[PDB]
């Protein structure tokens, strides 16, 4: 059921996998846009 599939998608390993995948994607895209940074130059 929708209730049961929503319950199964909330278990700890599945949620960890999704969270870390999204975070890794964000970090990869940021490093593709502003590469080779050793400091904060904006201000």
């Amino acid at each position: 059921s929708m209730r049961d599939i929503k319950t199964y998608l909330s278990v700890a390993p599945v949620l960890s996998t999704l969270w870390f995948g999204a975070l890794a994607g964000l970090l990869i895209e940021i490093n593709r846009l502003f590469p080779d940074a050793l400091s904060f130059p904006f201000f």
Partner: protein
């Protein structure tokens, strides 16, 4: 009778159980009180025997899980073929195998990792592979990327089929217990249907596809101009232009004129001088003869027509002259215990893998394999490791049988009882022989190191000093090298070039194989191998034989297969369980296999592999230093580890830097395991108490109470990280060395 009987709709397909972790266990289904629960959930997942005591349910679960494994394997093969078709230089490699390095993995350009796309040749940049897929694909007649795409798609469809079959044969139509216990019919089908027909179909493919394609390939024809595989089928003139025996069709097959087919059914032996591999016609005749052997074999057992040997009758008929029928009662044991079957099958498969590793280096079956040194080293080492692991698993599951299934009140066997009644004598004699071998093998190296350090080289054990020649091995070599002509008149050359008969095969200015000489160093290292193997046997056999009791713990079988100890009394009783014997055996297995692969690497680099000039002067990679330097420990330390580690430690800044990074990381993991191996859990629980106080101070103490790892889990984590670190260190060392210098 042998009939297909099932039950319809046994288990309802629902998502209710997915939302209840631990559903399979009556003690786990409650929910967690401590962190230990979580670990237990993963440790007891595939232990079906402990879930219930019903044999039929266990069999059904086993069947479905095996279908799942087949689905995963098919996914792996589909990925391999797709990556070969989409991201490789296989087509370019087809036109210059000796100068181009195979590659089928490429990386994306971020954070500077694109440096790993190395210059492998043929206008392509990527990571070099050592699995040997290119040689296998060339031997199959593959010349295009479209064919690889089609194979990958087919593998994806097969993976889907296997997964659906698992679902159907579990949740819809589950076979009954009588279906699984028809061992005669299963043996008949797997001997004849699976092996015999499989070999027949592959031999047919080799005769109708592989040979004509490889003829054009070796004739120097552009791959895009080679006729398509189906042209050789619907146009027999094209195939007859190479093998004239195709003009008469299959008439000689039925008229017993088989000598007409000698053009592509040979008994040559040796190697093809162009590719450096076995003749394809020999392989085809081999698969034909093997197919006949298995087809005949698969008619021995009786199913439904009153013809064929019954398995129980054979075992009960042999009996024994020692006042009893020894082999009576084994059929019942082997038809009611999954663990005993698993033990026997694991032992057989593990030994077979070691045989495969030994035979594939000395009789290289694929074209352009022998002169690809990295692939040869990789294949030998890989199959050695796999075989060792399977053999250890055999002992583990035999112990499980002894603890859980053995019962002399319902299923008696005389031979097992007789063995259990002289276990002291057996174990004591094995202990003594281990001590004798250890002394008279390792002490020789110690004596040589001492004599060399004291300036007395004339008192060493060496070819220039006190000699210990392996005369029996030399005699067997001489018999095998002169076999063509007297004892095997129908063969042209011997089975291998290593036997003798001075002759060398060179492909692209590189040595493929040649005779291998044996001396004092070979004698010493062979008796070292004997020592390590006998010790491993001592440990594992002690584990299996004393699983149920001993003079120290009379009632050990009541404590189970896997328990940490029985207390500090009686002097101390840590590690008396059978699981601990398996735990200890893994270390000695690692020792033995590591020495085997080091011996292989040094001997092959020193006496076989190398280059040859126009005049025929062979220069070896390490220049024949094995004979004089491998007879002391200082020689192994200086001339093997220190000398050959240079490639892996100088790899930074090139395409091989990943191997240096893995070298360091694997040393790290190996050293990390020692923390788990040397300590105990009481210290760690006491530390966790202090940390939990701090979390309680700030209202962040979890409801799932933290606990230290159990004693067994500590040992398991320790041995796992020790093995991973050591094996990965050696992996990086080998791959960097052989790729850079070979």
């Amino acid at each position: 009778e042998v009939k297909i009987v099932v039950d319809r709709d046994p288990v309802k397909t629902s998502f209710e159980e997915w939302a209840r972790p631990g559903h399979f266990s009556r003690t786990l289904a409650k929910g967690p009180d401590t962190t230990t629960w979580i670990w237990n959930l993963h440790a007891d997942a595939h232990d079906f025997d402990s879930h219930t005591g019903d044999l039929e349910e266990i069999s059904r679960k086993v069947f479905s899980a095996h279908f799942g494994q087949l689905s995963i394997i098919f996914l792996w093969l589909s990925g391999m073929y797709f990556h070969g078709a989409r991201f490789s230089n296989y087509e370019a490699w087809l036109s210059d195998p000796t100068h181009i390095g195979p590659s089928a993995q490429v990386v994306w350009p971020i954070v500077g990792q694109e440096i790993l796309n190395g210059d492998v040749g043929g206008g392509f940049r990527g990571i070099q592979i050592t699995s040997g897929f290119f040689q296998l694909w060339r031997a199959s007649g593959i010349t295009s990327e479209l064919q690889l795409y089609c194979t990958a798609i087919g593998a994806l469809i097969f993976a889907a089929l296997m997964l659906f079959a698992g679902w159907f044969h579990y949740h819809k139509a589950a076979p009954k217990l009588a279906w699984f216990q028809d061992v005669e019919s299963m043996l008949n089908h797997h001997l004849a249907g699976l092996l015999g027909l499989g070999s027949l179909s592959w031999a047919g493919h080799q005769i109708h596809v592989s040979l004509p394609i490889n003829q054009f390939l070796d004739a120097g024809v552009d791959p895009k101009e080679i006729p398509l595989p189906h042209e050789f089928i619907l146009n027999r003139d094209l195939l007859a232009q190479l093998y004239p025996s195709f003009a008469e069709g299959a008439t000689p097959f039925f008229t017993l004129n088989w000598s007409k087919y000698a053009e592509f059914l040979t008994f040559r032996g040796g190697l093809d001088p162009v590719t450096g591999g076995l003749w394809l016609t020999d392989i085809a005749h081999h698969h034909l003869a093997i197919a006949i052997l298995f087809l005949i074999a698969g008619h021995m057992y009786r199913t439904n027509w009153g013809i064929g040997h019954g398995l129980k009758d054979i075992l009960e008929a042999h009996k024994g002259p020692f006042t009893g029928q020894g082999h009576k009662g084994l059929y019942e044991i082997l038809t009611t215990s999954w663990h005993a079957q698993l033990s026997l099958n694991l032992a057989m498969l593990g030994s077979t893998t070691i045989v495969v590793a030994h035979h594939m280096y000395s009789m290289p079956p694929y074209p352009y394999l022998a002169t690809d040194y990295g692939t040869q080293l990789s294949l030998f080492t890989h199959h050695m490791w796999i075989g060792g692991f399977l053999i250890v698993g055999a002992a583990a599951h035999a112990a499980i049988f002894m603890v859980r299934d053995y019962d002399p009140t319902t299923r008696y066997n005389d031979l097992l009882d007789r063995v259990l009644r002289h276990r002291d004598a057996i174990i004591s004699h094995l202990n003594w022989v281990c001590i004798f071998l250890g002394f008279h093998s390792f002490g020789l190296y110690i004596h040589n190191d001492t004599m060399s350090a004291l300036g007395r080289p004339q008192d060493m054990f060496s070819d220039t000093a006190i000699q210990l020649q392996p005369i029996f091995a030399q005699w067997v070599q001489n018999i095998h090298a002169t076999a063509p002509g007297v004892t095997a008149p129908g063969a042209t050359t011997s089975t291998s070039l290593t036997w003798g008969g001075g002759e060398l095969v060179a492909v692209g200015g590189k040595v493929a194989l040649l005779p291998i000489p044996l001396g004092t160093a070979d004698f010493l290292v062979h008796h070292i191998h004997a020592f390590t193997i006998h010790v491993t046997v001592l440990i594992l056999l002690k584990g299996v034989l004393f699983a149920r009791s001993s003079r120290l713990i009379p009632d050990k079988a009541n404590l189970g297969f896997r328990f940490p100890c029985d207390g500090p009394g009686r002097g101390g009783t840590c590690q008396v369980s059978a699981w601990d014997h398996v735990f200890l055996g893994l270390f000695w297995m690692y020792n033995a296999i590591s020495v085997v692969i080091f011996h292989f690497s040094w001997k092959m680099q020193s006496d076989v592999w190398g280059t040859i000039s126009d005049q025929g002067m062979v220069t070896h990679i390490t220049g024949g230093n094995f004979a004089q330097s491998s007879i002391t420990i200082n020689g192994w330390l200086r001339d093997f580890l220190w000398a050959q580690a240079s490639q892996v430690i100088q790899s930074y800044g090139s395409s091989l830097s990943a191997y240096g990074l893995f070298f360091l990381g694997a040393h790290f993991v190996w050293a990390f395991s020692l923390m788990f191996l040397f300590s105990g859990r009481g210290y760690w629980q006491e530390l966790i108490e202090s940390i939990v106080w701090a979390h309680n101070k700030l209202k962040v103490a979890p409801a799932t109470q933290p606990r230290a790892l159990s004693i067994i889990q500590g040992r398991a984590v320790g041995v796992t990280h020790y093995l991973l670190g050591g094996i990965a260190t050696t992996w990086a060392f080998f791959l960097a060395r052989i790729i850079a210098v070979g």
